[PDB]
Amino acid sequence: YYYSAVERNNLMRLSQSIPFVPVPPRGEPVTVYRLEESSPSILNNSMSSWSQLGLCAKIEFLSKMGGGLRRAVKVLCTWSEHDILKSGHLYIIKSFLPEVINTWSSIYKEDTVLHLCLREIQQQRAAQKLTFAFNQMKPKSIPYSPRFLEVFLLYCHSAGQWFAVEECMTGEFRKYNNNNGDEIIPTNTLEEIMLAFSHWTYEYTRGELLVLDLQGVGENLTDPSVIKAEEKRSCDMVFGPANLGEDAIKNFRAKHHCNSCCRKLKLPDLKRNDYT
Amino acid sequence: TNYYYSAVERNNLMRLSQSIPFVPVPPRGEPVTVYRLEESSPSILNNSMSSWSQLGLCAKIEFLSKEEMGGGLRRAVKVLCTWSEHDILKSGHLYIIKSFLPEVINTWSSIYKEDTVLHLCLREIQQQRAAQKLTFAFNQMKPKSIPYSPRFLEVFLLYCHSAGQWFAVEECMTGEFRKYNNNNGDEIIPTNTLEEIMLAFSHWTYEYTRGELLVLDLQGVGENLTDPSVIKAEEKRSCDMVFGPANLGEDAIKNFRAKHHCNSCCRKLKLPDLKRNDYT
Ligand SMILES: Nc1ncnc2c1ncn2[C@@H]1O[C@H](COP(=O)(O)OP(=O)(O)O)[C@@H](O)[C@H]1O
Numbered sequence A: 001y002y003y004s005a006v007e008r009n010n011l012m013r014l015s016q017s018i019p020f021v022p023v024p025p026r027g028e029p030v031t032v033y034r035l036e037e038s039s040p041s042i043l044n045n046s047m048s049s050w051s052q053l054g055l056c057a058k059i060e061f062l063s064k065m066g067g068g069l070r071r072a073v074k075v076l077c078t079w080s081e082h083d084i085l086k087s088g089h090l091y092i093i094k095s096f097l098p099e100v101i102n103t104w105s106s107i108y109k110e111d112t113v114l115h116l117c118l119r120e121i122q123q124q125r126a127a128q129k130l131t132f133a134f135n136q137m138k139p140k141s142i143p144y145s146p147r148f149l150e151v152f153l154l155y156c157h158s159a160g161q162w163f164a165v166e167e168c169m170t171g172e173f174r175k176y177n178n179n180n181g182d183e184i185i186p187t188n189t190l191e192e193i194m195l196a197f198s199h200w201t202y203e204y205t206r207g208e209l210l211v212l213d214l215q216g217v218g219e220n221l222t223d224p225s226v227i228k229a230e231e232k233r234s235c236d237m238v239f240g241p242a243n244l245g246e247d248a249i250k251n252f253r254a255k256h257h258c259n260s261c262c263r264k265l266k267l268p269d270l271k272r273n274d275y276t
Numbered sequence B: 001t002n003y004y005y006s007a008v009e010r011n012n013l014m015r016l017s018q019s020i021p022f023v024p025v026p027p028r029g030e031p032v033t034v035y036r037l038e039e040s041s042p043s044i045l046n047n048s049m050s051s052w053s054q055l056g057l058c059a060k061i062e063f064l065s066k067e068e069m070g071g072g073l074r075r076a077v078k079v080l081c082t083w084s085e086h087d088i089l090k091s092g093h094l095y096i097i098k099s100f101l102p103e104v105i106n107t108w109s110s111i112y113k114e115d116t117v118l119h120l121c122l123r124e125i126q127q128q129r130a131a132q133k134l135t136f137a138f139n140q141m142k143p144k145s146i147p148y149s150p151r152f153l154e155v156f157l158l159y160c161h162s163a164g165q166w167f168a169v170e171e172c173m174t175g176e177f178r179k180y181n182n183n184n185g186d187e188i189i190p191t192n193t194l195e196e197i198m199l200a201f202s203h204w205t206y207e208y209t210r211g212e213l214l215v216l217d218l219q220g221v222g223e224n225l226t227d228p229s230v231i232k233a234e235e236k237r238s239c240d241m242v243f244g245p246a247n248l249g250e251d252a253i254k255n256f257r258a259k260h261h262c263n264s265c266c267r268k269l270k271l272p273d274l275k276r277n278d279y280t
């Protein structure tokens, strides 16, 4: 029937040279592994185990960031297999500094960086399990709910190295307390709740564990330090790579200042006698 | 004075402070860059303009076979798609990668002095798209009474860094791969409706393009076709008769008009006999 000129033109065009400019892909493809949970809806009673099947994710570099032991860059995830990472979402990728790798070079014969990453991610998951328990038991009078971002393990061939990746938060990033026990002076309810949380972890684990270095945006936290409060040696004191002083626990008990949240949580004074 | 954690809760936390087993399943697959021939109006393909993609996409293919099928100017090898950025290709799906015979290149080197292979691929994919556009008009305008719709597979351009070369890629069809008509202008005698429709399609293209184009070498599995030969019925230029590289027989259009036999479909489409006169 009707065989237009547009239709004809578009057909005939295919018979001739159409311009083609091969442009290498944008960004880099990377492999992602997840630390899975046997019971997500009940994270504190769930078992953590590493996934085996690495899924691909496509990331594009945007910018950057530096803290203590890591270098961080902000990226965009344009796509990923089975949505292991959310497409159209911003992420932060972290890698350990030279000194840090050089410090655990002895502790970890081969795949030092890989192990450092595994431990770092496992550390944040531990904190996560504690915030989860916290939100389950805290009184209804306590509004907010601390939460740690999930971190994923990442392998990049481009760079030929292992990294940790997590969602990028938007807003003013702030540190509520640190590895030496210093705390900000709570100017609002949320900050109080955060400060009370570190106290709560100690009491909740019968003085066995303490989470310091609470930092993030709002109630969303990341990069915590999970301290085995009874270890008498730094080398075996922290879950993942962290800058700790052996005075940490003692310092926290001395410096911490209980607030209306600590009281709402019915938490005992950290200065009390441990055998009383 | 409190409500501390349980054993299960404590075990799950403390276990994270220790080395947990991580056995990364070994990496299989070949990294490749996929390029697509895009369309301005994919919804109205026959009224759409074709343009090559600029920015390449990432994908991974498993070369599970060394079996190179075919006897023509090209050879086909099955590969597996582990993953493809944006799922342009389907993961955990079999594809066919096609390349030409060095001889063929050597032949066209005297026409495509530079990046001969890539150029041939660009042409092959453009040729199949031309076939697709005609099939789109065909299925869109054909009478409702006709139950079948010819379909050409989509072909993508693929670059392999490891193999250091360009290939054309398309889904791998499973089933009896057959030919309805060929480059000589010869056709089979239809046994069923599907075949009658395939054969009528070739006739239809000649008619639809007012005698400018003829699609021959209809072949594939069932309705799904691939590797057709879009012939510029009037051209005389050495290698300018077919949109893509193909060996045409001694005056294929002549043979086709002479040997083709119209069927119930040709009549359903109201097509006129090819043996008639061009001018009278
Ligand atoms: N998840 C995040 N979202 C937004 N910004 C972040 C995030 N994590 C870290 N940052 C920013 O990048 C800086 C470095 O953080 P990081 O790489 O974790 O270093 P560190 O080795 O100190 O833990 C921080 O000071 C912070 O401003």
Ligand SMILES: Nc1ncnc2c1ncn2[C@@H]1O[C@H](COP(=O)(O)OP(=O)(O)O)[C@@H](O)[C@H]1O
Residues within 6 Å of the ligand: B069, B070, B071, B072, B073, B074, B075, B076, B096, B098, B153, B170, B171, B172, B173, B174, B177, B226, B227
């Ligand atoms: N899309 C496909 N699906 C399944 N098999 C295919 C496909 N394309 C090609 N083949 C197989 O591989 C062979 C190569 O065909 P083709 O690319 O057309 O090369 P040739 O130039 O020799 O005709 C075919 O004969 C067929 O058996």
Ligand SMILES: [Mg+2]
Residues within 6 Å of the ligand: B070, B072, B219, B227
């Ligand atoms: Mg063939």
Ligand SMILES: [Zn+2]
Residues within 6 Å of the ligand: A196, A199, A256, A257, A258, A259, A262, A267
């Ligand atoms: Zn307190």
Ligand SMILES: [Zn+2]
Residues within 6 Å of the ligand: B199, B200, B203, B260, B261, B262, B263, B266, B271
């Ligand atoms: Zn006919």
